[PDB]
Amino acid sequence: HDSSKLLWATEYIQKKGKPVLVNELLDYLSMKKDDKVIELLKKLDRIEFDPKKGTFKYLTYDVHSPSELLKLLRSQVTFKGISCKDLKDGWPQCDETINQLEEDSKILVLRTKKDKTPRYVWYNSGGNLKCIDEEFVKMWENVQLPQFAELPRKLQDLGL
Amino acid sequence: DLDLERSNRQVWLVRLPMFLAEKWRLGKIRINKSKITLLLNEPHEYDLELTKKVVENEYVFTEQTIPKKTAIVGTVCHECQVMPYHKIVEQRRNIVKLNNKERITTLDETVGVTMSHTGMSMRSDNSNFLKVMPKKEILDYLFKLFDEYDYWSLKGLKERTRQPEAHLKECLDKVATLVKKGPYAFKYT
């Protein structure tokens, strides 16, 4: 099956991670010397097999920079939000970059330390603002509210 | 093709005692003209009564939605009943009021020999009742397996291969895309 030989060469195009030559990849695959796999190589959208000599470029997520990452955050406006699996392959070490891009610059998803923060795609406007003490958080949650029209009526007794 | 043969074979119908009819499962009938009898093949002699004279709307048929083969014999001509060493049959009727059943036996030993098999006895069972790979090499067999059946589950695939299943699971995520739900559930693509 030539599809097994082509996908292993396509894996070798991703395992090399550089722009190697077509005959050199044929020498790296050794026994693979066919021409129909090269016909599907330029036809492959992920493996950018350019005609200018041997150029093997992968796809996935090309955002290898935080400046590219902010445009990715501006890309998903009122759409969805990806995880981080395409990010860690298009760029080595991203969760450290999330820690440096704090305050709504990389509103990720700290799932677990054991999960090594399984990140997500989000960004607010201020994000952090963590000067609120947890003593203020408990008193914020210890308040019961008279619902419906009572609290508007109690606001007129209070002032608003 | 249910049809009628004659509907004219006039027969009779006699009620018998139990000992003679169930034996039958060729005598001589003497007809004296209004009190008939039977010379039995040997042995005793019995008298017949006319159970009913008008026996109309009563006939006789045989048999060889799903229909089946119908065979219409004939009619019924008269109603009859057999009436009966007569004291021996009365003694045989008296012997019928004597049959019964048995009683529960009693196991009569030193008990603990029989009682030892109840709980623990260290005599177990004695019965048969309800006892109950390289990366490029395995991928070449996987592409050979994907050429035959592509949308196939991994349960029979781990059975059909039965080699390095961890290396089989690594190659299944390598150059194949396992479809989660839908019709081809857990099926590579």
Short mmCIF file of C-alpha atoms in Angstrom, two decimals:
data_model
loop_
_atom_site.label_atom_id
_atom_site.label_comp_id
_atom_site.label_asym_id
_atom_site.label_seq_id
_atom_site.Cartn_x
_atom_site.Cartn_y
_atom_site.Cartn_z
CA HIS A 1 0.00 0.00 0.00
CA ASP A 2 1.49 3.30 -1.18
CA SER A 3 -0.80 5.28 1.14
CA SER A 4 1.13 3.85 4.08
CA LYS A 5 4.40 4.88 2.42
CA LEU A 6 3.05 8.36 1.63
CA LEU A 7 1.67 9.02 5.12
CA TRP A 8 4.93 7.88 6.72
CA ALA A 9 6.73 10.29 4.40
CA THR A 10 4.15 12.92 5.35
CA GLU A 11 4.92 12.08 8.97
CA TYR A 12 8.61 12.37 8.07
CA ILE A 13 7.85 15.81 6.63
CA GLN A 14 6.44 16.74 10.03
CA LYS A 15 9.09 14.85 12.02
CA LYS A 16 11.90 16.68 10.21
CA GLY A 17 10.31 20.08 10.79
CA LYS A 18 12.56 21.75 8.21
CA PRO A 19 12.62 22.39 4.45
CA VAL A 20 14.42 19.27 3.20
CA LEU A 21 14.73 18.33 -0.45
CA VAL A 22 12.39 15.94 -2.26
CA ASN A 23 15.17 13.55 -3.27
CA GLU A 24 16.71 13.90 0.20
CA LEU A 25 13.35 12.95 1.72
CA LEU A 26 13.27 10.12 -0.81
CA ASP A 27 16.70 9.18 0.54
CA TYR A 28 15.44 9.66 4.10
CA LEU A 29 12.54 7.33 3.29
CA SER A 30 15.13 5.24 1.35
CA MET A 31 12.85 2.68 -0.32
CA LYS A 32 10.26 5.32 -1.31
CA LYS A 33 11.13 6.46 -4.83
CA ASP A 34 7.68 6.79 -6.41
CA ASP A 35 6.23 9.89 -8.05
CA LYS A 36 2.53 9.68 -7.18
CA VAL A 37 3.27 10.50 -3.53
CA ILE A 38 4.94 13.71 -4.68
CA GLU A 39 1.75 14.45 -6.62
CA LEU A 40 -0.22 14.35 -3.38
CA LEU A 41 2.56 16.16 -1.51
CA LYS A 42 1.95 19.53 -3.17
CA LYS A 43 -1.77 18.69 -3.12
CA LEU A 44 -1.59 18.33 0.68
CA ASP A 45 -2.71 21.57 2.31
CA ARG A 46 -0.99 20.87 5.64
CA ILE A 47 2.43 20.06 4.15
CA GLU A 48 3.23 23.17 2.13
CA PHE A 49 5.36 21.49 -0.53
CA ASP A 50 6.46 24.63 -2.37
CA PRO A 51 7.89 24.39 -5.91
CA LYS A 52 10.91 26.55 -4.98
CA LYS A 53 13.34 23.64 -4.34
CA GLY A 54 12.65 21.42 -1.32
CA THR A 55 10.42 23.40 1.04
CA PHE A 56 8.38 21.38 3.55
CA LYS A 57 6.24 23.63 5.74
CA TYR A 58 3.60 22.37 8.18
CA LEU A 59 0.30 24.08 8.96
CA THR A 60 -1.82 23.75 12.15
CA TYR A 61 -1.31 27.01 14.04
CA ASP A 62 1.41 29.32 12.76
CA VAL A 63 1.06 31.63 15.79
CA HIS A 64 4.56 31.20 17.20
CA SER A 65 4.46 34.67 18.87
CA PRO A 66 2.32 36.46 21.48
CA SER A 67 1.67 39.21 18.92
CA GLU A 68 0.30 36.53 16.62
CA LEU A 69 -1.57 35.12 19.61
CA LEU A 70 -3.43 38.38 20.25
CA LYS A 71 -4.58 38.40 16.62
CA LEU A 72 -5.81 34.86 17.22
CA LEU A 73 -7.77 36.23 20.18
CA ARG A 74 -9.14 38.93 17.88
CA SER A 75 -9.91 36.22 15.31
CA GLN A 76 -12.47 34.35 17.45
CA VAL A 77 -14.64 37.42 18.15
CA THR A 78 -18.24 36.19 18.71
CA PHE A 79 -17.30 32.73 17.43
CA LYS A 80 -15.78 29.89 19.46
CA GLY A 81 -12.61 29.18 21.44
CA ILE A 82 -9.95 26.56 20.77
CA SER A 83 -7.96 24.60 23.35
CA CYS A 84 -4.16 24.74 23.04
CA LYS A 85 -3.13 21.61 21.13
CA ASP A 86 -2.46 23.42 17.85
CA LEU A 87 -0.62 26.11 19.83
CA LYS A 88 1.85 23.78 21.55
CA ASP A 89 2.75 22.19 18.20
CA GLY A 90 3.11 25.44 16.27
CA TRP A 91 5.10 26.90 19.17
CA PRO A 92 7.10 25.13 21.90
CA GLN A 93 6.09 26.13 25.46
CA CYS A 94 2.88 28.17 25.55
CA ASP A 95 1.65 27.90 29.16
CA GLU A 96 4.64 29.92 30.36
CA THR A 97 3.71 32.56 27.77
CA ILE A 98 0.20 32.57 29.28
CA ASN A 99 1.67 33.40 32.70
CA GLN A 100 3.66 36.30 31.24
CA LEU A 101 0.63 37.46 29.20
CA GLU A 102 -1.52 37.88 32.28
CA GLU A 103 -4.37 40.39 32.76
CA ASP A 104 -6.76 39.49 29.88
CA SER A 105 -3.89 38.87 27.46
CA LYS A 106 -4.18 35.08 27.66
CA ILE A 107 -7.35 34.10 29.52
CA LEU A 108 -6.54 30.41 29.15
CA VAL A 109 -7.99 27.54 31.19
CA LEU A 110 -5.98 26.38 34.20
CA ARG A 111 -7.62 22.94 34.31
CA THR A 112 -5.15 21.27 36.69
CA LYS A 113 -1.45 21.23 37.54
CA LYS A 114 -1.61 17.53 36.69
CA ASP A 115 -3.31 18.59 33.44
CA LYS A 116 -0.59 21.28 33.19
CA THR A 117 -3.30 23.94 32.63
CA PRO A 118 -5.27 22.59 29.63
CA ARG A 119 -5.57 26.06 28.13
CA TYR A 120 -8.38 27.69 26.13
CA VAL A 121 -8.81 30.66 23.80
CA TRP A 122 -10.19 33.71 25.61
CA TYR A 123 -9.23 37.29 26.46
CA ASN A 124 -11.14 39.94 28.40
CA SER A 125 -10.14 43.59 28.84
CA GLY A 126 -8.64 43.72 32.33
CA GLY A 127 -8.72 40.04 33.28
CA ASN A 128 -6.55 40.00 36.39
CA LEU A 129 -7.28 42.77 38.95
CA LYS A 130 -6.49 40.31 41.75
CA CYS A 131 -6.16 42.92 44.52
CA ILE A 132 -9.56 41.84 45.87
CA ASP A 133 -8.83 39.97 49.09
CA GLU A 134 -10.51 36.64 49.76
CA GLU A 135 -11.96 38.15 52.94
CA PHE A 136 -13.85 40.45 50.59
CA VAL A 137 -14.93 37.39 48.58
CA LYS A 138 -16.50 35.62 51.57
CA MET A 139 -18.41 38.73 52.65
CA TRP A 140 -19.55 39.07 49.03
CA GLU A 141 -21.01 35.56 49.25
CA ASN A 142 -22.50 35.84 52.76
CA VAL A 143 -25.26 38.21 51.61
CA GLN A 144 -28.82 36.99 51.06
CA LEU A 145 -31.01 39.04 48.80
CA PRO A 146 -34.69 40.01 49.11
CA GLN A 147 -35.74 39.28 45.55
CA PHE A 148 -38.30 40.69 43.08
CA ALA A 149 -39.48 44.26 43.79
CA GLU A 150 -38.32 44.20 47.43
CA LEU A 151 -34.73 45.29 46.73
CA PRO A 152 -35.84 48.20 44.47
CA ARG A 153 -38.15 49.23 47.31
CA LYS A 154 -35.38 48.77 49.87
CA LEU A 155 -33.09 50.82 47.63
CA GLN A 156 -35.45 53.78 47.98
CA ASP A 157 -35.23 53.23 51.73
CA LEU A 158 -31.45 53.06 51.29
CA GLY A 159 -31.05 55.84 48.72
CA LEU A 160 -31.06 54.31 45.23
CA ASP B 1 -60.16 -28.79 -2.37
CA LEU B 2 -62.32 -29.73 0.61
CA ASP B 3 -65.07 -31.96 -0.77
CA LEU B 4 -67.62 -34.55 0.31
CA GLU B 5 -67.24 -38.28 -0.28
CA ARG B 6 -70.70 -39.68 0.47
CA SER B 7 -72.15 -38.36 3.76
CA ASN B 8 -74.10 -41.61 3.93
CA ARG B 9 -71.88 -44.14 5.70
CA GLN B 10 -74.27 -44.80 8.58
CA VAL B 11 -72.36 -45.75 11.73
CA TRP B 12 -73.20 -46.27 15.39
CA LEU B 13 -71.56 -45.04 18.59
CA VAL B 14 -71.15 -47.12 21.74
CA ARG B 15 -69.89 -46.17 25.21
CA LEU B 16 -67.68 -48.82 26.80
CA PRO B 17 -66.14 -49.53 30.20
CA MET B 18 -62.52 -48.58 30.75
CA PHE B 19 -60.85 -51.99 30.87
CA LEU B 20 -61.98 -53.18 27.44
CA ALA B 21 -61.78 -50.03 25.31
CA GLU B 22 -58.28 -49.11 26.50
CA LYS B 23 -57.30 -52.71 25.82
CA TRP B 24 -58.38 -52.09 22.21
CA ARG B 25 -55.98 -49.16 21.77
CA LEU B 26 -63.32 -59.13 17.06
CA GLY B 27 -66.43 -60.56 18.71
CA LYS B 28 -69.88 -61.57 17.48
CA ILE B 29 -72.89 -59.31 17.98
CA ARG B 30 -76.13 -61.27 18.37
CA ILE B 31 -79.16 -59.20 17.38
CA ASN B 32 -82.42 -60.61 18.77
CA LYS B 33 -85.51 -58.85 17.45
CA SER B 34 -85.35 -55.45 20.75
CA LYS B 35 -82.69 -56.97 23.01
CA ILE B 36 -79.28 -57.60 21.45
CA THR B 37 -76.01 -58.85 22.94
CA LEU B 38 -72.40 -59.71 22.07
CA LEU B 39 -70.54 -63.01 21.89
CA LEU B 40 -67.08 -61.77 22.83
CA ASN B 41 -63.87 -63.11 21.34
CA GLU B 42 -62.03 -65.13 23.97
CA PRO B 43 -65.23 -63.57 26.71
CA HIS B 44 -68.29 -62.54 28.71
CA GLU B 45 -71.65 -61.40 27.38
CA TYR B 46 -73.05 -57.89 27.79
CA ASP B 47 -76.25 -56.13 26.79
CA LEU B 48 -76.56 -52.99 24.65
CA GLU B 49 -79.02 -50.18 25.29
CA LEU B 50 -80.39 -47.65 22.81
CA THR B 51 -79.08 -44.40 24.25
CA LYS B 52 -80.99 -42.27 21.72
CA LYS B 53 -83.20 -43.12 18.75
CA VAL B 54 -83.36 -39.77 16.95
CA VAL B 55 -79.65 -39.16 16.36
CA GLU B 56 -80.07 -36.72 13.48
CA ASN B 57 -77.72 -33.75 12.97
CA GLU B 58 -74.85 -36.06 14.00
CA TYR B 59 -72.34 -37.33 11.44
CA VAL B 60 -68.75 -38.60 11.11
CA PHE B 61 -65.76 -37.09 9.27
CA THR B 62 -62.01 -37.65 9.04
CA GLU B 63 -58.91 -35.59 8.25
CA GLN B 64 -55.65 -36.36 6.47
CA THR B 65 -55.09 -19.23 7.12
CA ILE B 66 -53.66 -22.64 6.23
CA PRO B 67 -56.32 -25.11 5.04
CA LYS B 68 -55.87 -28.88 5.14
CA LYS B 69 -57.33 -31.99 3.56
CA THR B 70 -60.91 -32.79 4.62
CA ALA B 71 -62.45 -36.26 4.30
CA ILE B 72 -66.20 -36.51 4.92
CA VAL B 73 -67.07 -40.08 5.89
CA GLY B 74 -70.74 -40.54 6.75
CA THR B 75 -73.56 -40.19 9.22
CA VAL B 76 -74.59 -41.65 12.57
CA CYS B 77 -77.43 -44.18 12.52
CA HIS B 78 -78.14 -44.92 16.21
CA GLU B 79 -76.83 -44.25 19.73
CA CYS B 80 -75.62 -47.20 21.79
CA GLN B 81 -74.03 -48.05 25.14
CA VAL B 82 -72.64 -51.32 26.51
CA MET B 83 -74.17 -52.48 29.80
CA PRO B 84 -72.74 -55.48 31.72
CA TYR B 85 -68.08 -63.95 36.43
CA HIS B 86 -69.83 -60.65 37.15
CA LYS B 87 -68.83 -60.85 40.82
CA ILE B 88 -65.15 -60.92 39.82
CA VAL B 89 -65.52 -57.53 38.13
CA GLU B 90 -67.33 -56.34 41.26
CA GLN B 91 -64.34 -57.67 43.19
CA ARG B 92 -62.21 -55.81 40.65
CA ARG B 93 -64.34 -52.75 41.39
CA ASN B 94 -63.81 -53.48 45.09
CA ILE B 95 -60.06 -53.78 44.46
CA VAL B 96 -60.14 -50.25 43.02
CA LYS B 97 -60.90 -48.95 46.54
CA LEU B 98 -57.53 -50.11 47.92
CA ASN B 99 -54.82 -48.46 45.82
CA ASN B 100 -52.81 -45.62 47.35
CA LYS B 101 -49.30 -44.20 47.57
CA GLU B 102 -46.21 -44.72 49.70
CA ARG B 103 -44.75 -42.97 52.72
CA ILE B 104 -41.60 -40.98 53.38
CA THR B 105 -38.63 -43.20 54.24
CA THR B 106 -36.51 -42.49 57.32
CA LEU B 107 -32.71 -42.45 57.17
CA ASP B 108 -31.70 -44.57 60.14
CA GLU B 109 -27.98 -44.45 60.93
CA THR B 110 -25.61 -42.63 63.28
CA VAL B 111 -26.76 -39.30 61.73
CA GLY B 112 -23.38 -37.56 61.66
CA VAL B 113 -22.25 -39.67 58.72
CA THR B 114 -25.18 -38.26 56.75
CA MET B 115 -24.85 -34.90 58.50
CA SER B 116 -21.20 -34.51 57.49
CA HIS B 117 -22.14 -33.82 53.87
CA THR B 118 -24.34 -30.86 54.85
CA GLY B 119 -21.95 -28.08 55.80
CA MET B 120 -18.22 -28.22 55.17
CA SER B 121 -16.90 -31.59 53.99
CA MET B 122 -13.72 -30.80 51.96
CA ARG B 123 -15.05 -32.76 48.96
CA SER B 124 -15.21 -29.96 46.40
CA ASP B 125 -16.69 -29.86 42.87
CA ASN B 126 -17.27 -33.50 41.68
CA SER B 127 -19.57 -31.92 39.08
CA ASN B 128 -19.40 -30.13 35.72
CA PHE B 129 -22.32 -27.77 36.27
CA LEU B 130 -21.61 -24.05 35.65
CA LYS B 131 -17.83 -23.81 36.04
CA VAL B 132 -16.97 -21.14 33.36
CA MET B 133 5.61 -4.66 16.79
CA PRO B 134 7.50 -2.16 14.63
CA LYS B 135 5.95 1.14 13.61
CA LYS B 136 6.29 0.78 9.83
CA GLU B 137 5.57 -2.96 9.93
CA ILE B 138 2.31 -2.81 11.89
CA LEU B 139 1.16 0.18 9.84
CA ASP B 140 1.70 -1.86 6.67
CA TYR B 141 -0.60 -4.53 8.09
CA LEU B 142 -2.95 -1.75 9.19
CA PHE B 143 -3.07 -0.32 5.68
CA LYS B 144 -3.66 -3.87 4.47
CA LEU B 145 -6.45 -4.11 7.04
CA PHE B 146 -7.82 -0.69 6.07
CA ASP B 147 -7.88 -1.80 2.43
CA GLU B 148 -10.35 -4.57 3.30
CA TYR B 149 -12.46 -2.86 5.97
CA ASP B 150 -11.96 0.82 6.70
CA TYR B 151 -14.97 1.65 8.89
CA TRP B 152 -14.27 -1.09 11.43
CA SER B 153 -14.21 -1.16 15.23
CA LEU B 154 -11.07 -1.71 17.28
CA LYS B 155 -12.59 -4.58 19.27
CA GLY B 156 -12.33 -7.15 16.48
CA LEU B 157 -9.20 -5.38 15.24
CA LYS B 158 -7.40 -6.19 18.49
CA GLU B 159 -8.70 -9.75 18.01
CA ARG B 160 -7.72 -10.06 14.32
CA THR B 161 -4.25 -8.64 14.92
CA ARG B 162 -3.56 -9.89 18.49
CA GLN B 163 0.00 -8.53 18.40
CA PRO B 164 1.33 -5.41 20.15
CA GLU B 165 -1.95 -3.69 20.99
CA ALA B 166 -0.18 -0.65 22.49
CA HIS B 167 1.77 -0.29 19.25
CA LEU B 168 -1.50 -0.98 17.43
CA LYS B 169 -3.21 1.79 19.41
CA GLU B 170 -0.32 4.16 18.64
CA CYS B 171 -0.55 3.46 14.91
CA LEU B 172 -4.35 3.78 15.04
CA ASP B 173 -3.95 7.38 16.19
CA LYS B 174 -0.94 7.95 13.89
CA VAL B 175 -2.11 7.53 10.28
CA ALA B 176 -5.82 6.95 11.01
CA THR B 177 -8.72 9.01 12.31
CA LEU B 178 -11.06 7.03 14.57
CA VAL B 179 -14.66 8.21 14.13
CA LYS B 180 -16.32 8.62 17.52
CA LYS B 181 -20.12 8.39 17.12
CA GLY B 182 -22.51 8.02 14.21
CA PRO B 183 -22.81 4.76 12.28
CA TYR B 184 -19.06 4.04 12.09
CA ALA B 185 -18.44 4.29 15.83
CA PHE B 186 -14.84 3.64 16.96
CA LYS B 187 -13.93 3.23 13.28
CA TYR B 188 -10.75 4.59 11.72
CA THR B 189 -10.63 6.90 8.70
#
